[PDB]
Amino acid sequence: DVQLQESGPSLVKPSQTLSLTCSVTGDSITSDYWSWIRKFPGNRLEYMGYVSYSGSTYYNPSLKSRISITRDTSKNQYYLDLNSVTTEDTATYYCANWDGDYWGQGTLVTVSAA
Amino acid sequence: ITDSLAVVLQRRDWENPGVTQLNRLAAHPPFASWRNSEEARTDRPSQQLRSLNGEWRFAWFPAPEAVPESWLECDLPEADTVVVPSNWQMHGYDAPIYTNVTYPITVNPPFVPTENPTGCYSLTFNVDESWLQEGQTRIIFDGVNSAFHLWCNGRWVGYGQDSRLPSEFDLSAFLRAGENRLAVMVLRWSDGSYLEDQDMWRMSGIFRDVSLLHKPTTQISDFHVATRFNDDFSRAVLEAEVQMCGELRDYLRVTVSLWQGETQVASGTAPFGGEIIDERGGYADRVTLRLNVENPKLWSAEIPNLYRAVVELHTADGTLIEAEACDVGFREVRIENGLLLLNGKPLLIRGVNRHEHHPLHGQVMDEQTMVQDILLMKQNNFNAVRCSHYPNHPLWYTLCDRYGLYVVDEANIETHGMVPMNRLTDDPRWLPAMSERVTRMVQRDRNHPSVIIWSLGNESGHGANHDALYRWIKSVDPSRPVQYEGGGADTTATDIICPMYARVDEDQPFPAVPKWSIKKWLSLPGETRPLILCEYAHAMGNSLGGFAKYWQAFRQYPRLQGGFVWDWVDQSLIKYDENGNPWSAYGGDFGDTPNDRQFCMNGLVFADRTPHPALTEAKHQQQFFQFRLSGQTIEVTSEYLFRHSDNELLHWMVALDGKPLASGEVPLDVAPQGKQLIELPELPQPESAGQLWLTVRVVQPNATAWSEAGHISAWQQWRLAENLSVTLPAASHAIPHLTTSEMDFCIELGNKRWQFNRQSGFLSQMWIGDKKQLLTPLRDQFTRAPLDNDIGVSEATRIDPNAWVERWKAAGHYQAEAALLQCTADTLADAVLITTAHAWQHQGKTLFISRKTYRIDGSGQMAITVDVEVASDTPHPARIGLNCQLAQVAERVNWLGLGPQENYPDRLTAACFDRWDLPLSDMYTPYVFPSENGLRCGTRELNYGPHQWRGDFQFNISRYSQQQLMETSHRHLLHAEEGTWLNIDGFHMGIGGDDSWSPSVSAEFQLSAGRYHYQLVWCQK
Amino acid sequence: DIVLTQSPATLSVTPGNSVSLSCRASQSIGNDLHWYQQKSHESPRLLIKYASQSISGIPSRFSGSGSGTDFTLSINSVETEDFGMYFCQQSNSWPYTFGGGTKLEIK
């Protein structure tokens, strides 16, 4: 069966690049479309984007070109890179397949000067 | 015991076309068995209809015979937990085979191979005791490929063939309350396979849904709808024929009600019992109602007006036994007087062929995918789709009904691989099997408004079996025309001449089954049918050249009512690398044998639904508004037949070499088939030199169900004027210095220096300051990394000497060697002048001759002037220009010419002249099978880094040499090279596309002049 | 972009009773509306897809209805395990968007 899990820093500084990894086990990353979704402290959910089989990407315009979603078939993982983060990017990040049947556990990332 | 594998398998029903099914219920339109009329009306979900989709247990075997009797009674230790529906090849069990024509298995009808991949599915589930009190509980499989046997609670139920239609069995008496178990054994190959030889991946399994339907004992067994109209469509009759099963009791009634929204429009009630039909009477178990509808809203792809029809089976005291429903569309389809009419007007089919394909899921379809496809199509100017080449997933029709697309429904019958093609279709022994593939389709899809034409199958030659089946349909459902292309495209089995790959103007007169030029085909003696191409414009890779020729005939000849492009999506599949990285796979990439490689990629969109550039060329040619410019008046013509331009704005604009001087916006008020006149404001006109261009765009201000707001539906551009430049440059302050040596000539001026190698005759290097600019010398180029069309069906094994590539190869184009004939430097009053000449030869044959002059002036600008001579007797070159490898690598590319997208000579009508600026990445087209790509024509100025080239040329620029492209089988294996490769063409041959297995480049697009001249100006900023 | 509005923002109910949650789109989205459940410290869980299609492994008491702009998620006889947040999400057009959520609590 399929399993997804997010990994990466839980604390980052303003202006830096937030980078998360989603490890997929149980099936190949070439067998689905992959997404990133985040939940803001106020219970607001935002669909950040997804990468489909051809490699084409779809990013939420709200991210003003700060986002990049890539894949690595050899490691069976896909990634999220969010540049120039601010306190507004503090949220719980989740990876899930496009169908929405498989989700990671989610990981909290806090953006603070401290 | 007689349920035993041993016993069952014994008969080998899958090796016998005389047994297509065992215990399968009859076909019919989609049922839900609602038990409340409102739910039915609103399409709510029926609690009487349950999905068994999900996690199932599966086990694979190499032969049916290797299945263990145990399986019937109990799961298997090693059985995996798979998700259903799915294609087991998609899970890893065996490989998918990508073969076109040539059958996957060995041709020995009706036999199949002993090694025959069996998939054992099983499912444990609960049946609610209520379902067993009464009614009937039946099971449905919407698609099992290719054949299968079924057991329930260890008992044998039945068998079924036909991968693309539903098989239903009554489980009523095998079911026990609570826990039940199904054992389904699916055979990959069967005698049914002989009839399923479509050009697509060969897969297997329970790939469409599984359901349970509970019906009353006395129920609705089938129903059909029909709509007749009056001369002007101001009045219609809805006619519904209903049949029931069970005991007929006088208190039984039927009510058919027609809603339009919330509003009931008409209702009718009656009891069973039809009119006298013959000497024995009528059908007591049928009833037909007729509802009158005044001024019905008509359905069309332009405006999908729909009604809801509810069929209630009740008793007279008002008690509901059960209800069924369907959407209704009022439309009339007729061929009249050589023309195909829809609601009285003649269609112009802007269509495409579409397969059920998902790169991830193989052949399993989902709502999301369907919808995506639909919207892309509608957005891109398509009206219709052909179900190449089998009945589709049920939901499809419904969406088309709703979003508005004309559908050609096609029987699941293709025997392409027989010799001759006819072999089975002419054989009475296959008549039955075939028969079921046609009849069931009709019984199932007949009530959908989107379906306007029935098709007998594909590429199965022409046999007496077709003639019979065609007559059958005509008898049963005269509401639609029938079409079949096999055997010449104009047989007695088709109402429409529907060839594939017929050229516009040229004939291809194969014996027995020629393909006349479409314009000619129509006037052949005695011919009077309309002509619509079932497949045309093979969209494989860098293709679609000539697309416009088609559009133009369609527009000039009435009886040419369009066609279906081939095809929608690339049938590529996803594979993963050494690092869980995905990549697009094709024929033979699964160790699949034998196979047709790239032949499975002919879509307009990539498997992920991202468009190939061709898509635009289509969109533009198929646009519904047409323009003409007369003075400063624009004439707009609407190609809509039913709707008025009511979400349309026209934006106009004038610009001088990329610079905007004026804009307008004008709301369109044009009726279908109408004209609208538009007079433009007095247009500015400058002294400045350059070209003045008018460009107009039609915009959809408001969003629709398939388009966003601000969607552009059409466009057109014209050149208005030209102010030629009569201005001589400012006499150079400086003057270049020429330093000679025996190796080369150097030119210096400022920080700038240029070196020409006297041994080769090429500009070997250049510096701006201390920085070198080239990695490779600037040199003449006459070839190109072969497009799919240049190659055709030529293989290393079996060479096609006619394929462009072969010709080029054979003639030495790819391996010709230059020869310095001359190389001189001269000093001019205010400039340096270099002069060269080479000869390209192969085996003592001079193919071409290139003569240049470089002239560097005080401005530090070099002007290249080139003049090629091409031998009359050598295949015309793919191109003629120069290339070189730049040292730099910049983020953007900016040019003034056609774009923004990739455009070739026989494929550039959709492109606009202007100033474009894009990222380098966008100047490369990721065709899965790498080849020459990314060209942009009519360029006047191109800018990359500090370079600027000026003239009239076509060009392309990426990080891949032609050679790398040419030598990489897949795009995922390409690697970016040191700098930037630039190809600047004075000339480029067309891409072709009429088909991809013979030369398709029209003469007008072949570089056949002999003498070619061009000039450039290279310089810096 | 498409805006999804959910109502009520909060709903209190006693186990055993039934409830219906609303989600309305700013413009037609056909049937591309999905429902998710989310509990504290947990990832969202898909309950219904494409307005009314059932999902394997989800309690039968969950059902969805609607098309166009008005959708509803119904829970027949709420159980304690049902308390949490419910979000609708549309996939008709990019960017996909989520409703603001409805909190279901015990009364």
DSSP B488-503: TS-STT-SSB--BS--
Residue B242 to residue B272: CA distance in whole angstroms: 9
* DSSP-assigned beta bridge partners for residue B508: B515
Reported resolution, Å: 13.0
Break chain B into its structural domains and give their ranges.
Answer: 1-216, 217-331, 332-622, 623-728, 729-1021
Please name which of A3, A43, A4, B42 lies closest in space to residue C36, comparing C-alpha atoms: A43
Interchain contact A38–B (C-beta under 8 A): no
Q: Roughly how many angstroms between the first and final C-alpha of chain C, as a whole number?
A: 36
Residue C35 to residue B546: CA distance in whole angstroms: 47
- Give the other-Cβ count within 10 Å of B427's Cβ: 15
Superfamily of C1-107 according to CATH: Immunoglobulins (2.60.40.10)
Could you give the C-alpha distances from B635 to B336, B428, B716, B802, B913, in angstroms and in order?
A: 31, 58, 12, 45, 21
Residues on chain C touching A105 (C-beta within 8 angstroms) = 42-43
Both tokens of residue B154? 């260890």
Q: Roughly how many angstroms between the first and final C-alpha of chain B, as a whole number?
A: 89
The answer to whether the peptide bond before residue B788 is cis (omega within 30 degrees of 0) is: no
- Contact call for A47 and C101, based on CB within 8 A: no
Residues on chain A touching B606 (C-beta within 8 angstroms) = 54, 56
Listed as own residue / partner, the contacts of A65-71 with beta carbons closer than 8 Å and 24 or more positions apart are A69/A34, A69/A36, A71/A29, A71/A34, A71/B580, A71/B581, A71/B582
- Contact call for A31 and B576, based on CB within 8 A: yes
- Give the other-Cβ count within 10 Å of B517's Cβ: 15
Tell me whether domains B217-331 and B623-728 share a fold.
Answer: yes
* DSSP-assigned beta bridge partners for residue B386: B353, B408
Give yes or no for a contact between B957 and B983, defined as CB atoms under 8 angstroms apart: yes
Interchain contact B579–A (C-beta under 8 A): yes
Could you give the C-alpha distances from B94 to B87, B101, B117, in angstroms and in order?
A: 10, 21, 8
Could you give the C-alpha distances from A113 to A13, A19, A83, in angstroms and in order?
A: 5, 17, 15
Distance from CA of C38 to the nearest CA of B (A): 22
Strand order in the sheet with B286-294: B219-229, B235-245, B286-294
What's the topology of domain B623-728? Immunoglobulin-like (2.60.40)
Please name which of B516, B618, B520 lies closest in space to residue B567, comparing C-alpha atoms: B618
Interchain contact C7–B (C-beta under 8 A): no
Residue B578 to residue B341: CA distance in whole angstroms: 56
Distance from CA of C54 to the nearest CA of B (A): 8
Strand order in the sheet with B345-346: B333-336, B339-342, B345-346
Q: Which amino acid is at B871?
A: A
Query: Phi first, then psi: what are they for B123, rounded to 5°?
Result: -150, 135
Residues on chain C touching B371 (C-beta within 8 angstroms) = 30, 32, 92
Domains in chain A, ordered, with CATH?
1-114 (2.60.40.10)
Strands C45-49 and B286-294: unpaired
Looking at the partner chain, which of B81, B359, B580 has a beta carbon nearest the beta carbon of A73? B580
Q: Is B651 helix (H, G, I), strand (E, B) or coil?
A: strand
Substitution target from B50, B55, B367, B711 for chain C, most C beta carbons within 10 A:
B367
Exposed / middle / buried, residue B888 (Cβ in 10 Å: 0-12, 13-18, 19+):
middle
- Contact call for C32 and B368, based on CB within 8 A: yes
- Residue recorded with tokens 């007591």: B284
What's the topology of domain B1-216? Jelly Rolls (2.60.120)
- Residue recorded with tokens 């497949």: B535
**What number of CA atoms fall less than 13 Å from residue B61's CA on the CB side?**
18
Q: Which amino acid is at B351?
A: G
Query: Phi first, then psi: what are they for B739, rounded to 5°?
Result: -110, 115
Interchain contact B128–C (C-beta under 8 A): no
Residues on chain A touching B583 (C-beta within 8 angstroms) = 30, 73
Q: Is B71 helix (H, G, I), strand (E, B) or coil?
A: helix
B614-649: buried (b, 16+ CB within 10 Å) or exposed (e) per residue? Answer: bbbbbbbbbbbbebebeeeebebebbbbbeebebbb
Binding residues of B: 100, 199, 414, 416, 459, 535-538, 595, 599, 602, 997
How wide is the angle at C-alpha B96 spanned by C-alphas B92 and B100, nearest 5°? 175
For the residues of B345-409, what is the DSSP string, one character each? EE--EEEEE----BTTTBT---HHHHHHHHHHHHHTT--EEE-TTS---THHHHHIIIII-EEEE
* Ramachandran bin of B465, using left for φ above 0, alpha for ψ from -120 to 50, beta for the remaining angles: alpha
* Annotation marks residue B65 as catalytic: no
Residue B624 makes CB contacts below 8 A (sequence gap 6+) with: B381, B638, B639, B640, B713, B714
Q: Is B430 helix (H, G, I), strand (E, B) or coil?
A: helix
Looking at chain C, which subunits does it touch, using at least 3 CB pairs closer than 8 Å as the criterion?
A, B
Nearest CA in chain A to B581: A73
Interchain contact B91–A (C-beta under 8 A): no
How wide is the angle at C-alpha A50 spanned by C-alphas B96 and A104, nearest 5°? 90
Interchain contact A101–B (C-beta under 8 A): no
Binding residues of B for substrate: 100, 199, 459, 535-538, 602, 997
Technique used = cryo-EM
Distance from CA of B371 to the nearest CA of C (A): 8
* DSSP-assigned beta bridge partners for residue B781: B881
Nearest CA in chain A to C3: A46
The answer to whether the peptide bond before residue B300 is cis (omega within 30 degrees of 0) is: no
Residue B620 to residue B907: CA distance in whole angstroms: 11
Q: Which amino acid is at B138?
A: R
Interface B-C, measured as beta-carbon pairs within 8 A, has a size of: 24
Q: Roughly how many angstroms between the first and final C-alpha of chain A, as a whole number?
A: 40
Residues on chain C touching A104 (C-beta within 8 angstroms) = 43
Give yes or no for a contact between B683 and B649, defined as CB atoms under 8 angstroms apart: no
Distance from CA of B401 to the nearest CA of C (A): 13
Interchain contact B720–A (C-beta under 8 A): no
Residue A24 to residue B675: CA distance in whole angstroms: 58
The hierarchical CATH code for the domain B217-331 is 2.60.40.10
* Ramachandran bin of B643, using left for φ above 0, alpha for ψ from -120 to 50, beta for the remaining angles: beta
B45-60: buried (b, 16+ CB within 10 Å) or exposed (e) per residue? Answer: bbebbbebbbebbbbb
Binding residues of B for Na(+): 199, 599, 602
- Contact call for A72 and B579, based on CB within 8 A: yes
Residue B329 to residue B402: CA distance in whole angstroms: 9
Interchain contact B81–C (C-beta under 8 A): no
Catalytic residue among B196, B312, B535, B806: B535
Residue B401 to residue A88: CA distance in whole angstroms: 45
Residue B1005 to residue B790: CA distance in whole angstroms: 13
Give yes or no for a contact between C93 and A60, defined as CB atoms under 8 angstroms apart: no
Distance from CA of C42 to the nearest CA of A (A): 7
Residue C77 to residue A57: CA distance in whole angstroms: 41
Looking at the partner chain, which of A54, A71, A73 has a beta carbon nearest the beta carbon of B607? A54
Find residues 72-91 of chain A whose CB sits inside 8 Å of chain B: 72-77
Interchain contact B51–C (C-beta under 8 A): yes
Find the length of chain B.
1021
Alpha helices (H) along B557-630: 614-621
Distance from CA of B577 to the nearest CA of A (A): 5
- Give the other-Cβ count within 10 Å of B745's Cβ: 20
Q: What is the CA radius of gyration of chain C?
A: 13
Residue B863 to residue B310: CA distance in whole angstroms: 77
Percent of residues in chain A assigned helix, strand, coil, to nearest 5: 10, 50, 40
The hierarchical CATH code for the domain B332-622 is 3.20.20.80
**Residues C94, C95, C96, C99, Cα dihedral to 10°:** -130
Looking at the partner chain, which of A28, A29, A53 has a beta carbon nearest the beta carbon of B607? A53
What is the DSSP code (8-state) at residue B579?
T
Both tokens of residue C54? 């059932």
Looking at the partner chain, which of B44, B54, B705 has a beta carbon nearest the beta carbon of C65? B44
Most distant pair of Cα atoms in chain C: their distance? 38
Residue C30 to residue C35: CA distance in whole angstroms: 15
* Annotation marks residue B129 as catalytic: no
Interchain contact B705–C (C-beta under 8 A): yes
* DSSP-assigned beta bridge partners for residue B1017: B863, B950
Interchain contact C45–A (C-beta under 8 A): yes
The hierarchical CATH code for the domain B729-1021 is 2.70.98.10
Q: Is B920 helix (H, G, I), strand (E, B) or coil?
A: helix
Interchain contact B38–C (C-beta under 8 A): no
Distance from CA of B32 to the nearest CA of C (A): 14
- Contact call for A43 and C89, based on CB within 8 A: no
Looking at the partner chain, which of A29, A55, A56 has a beta carbon nearest the beta carbon of B580? A29
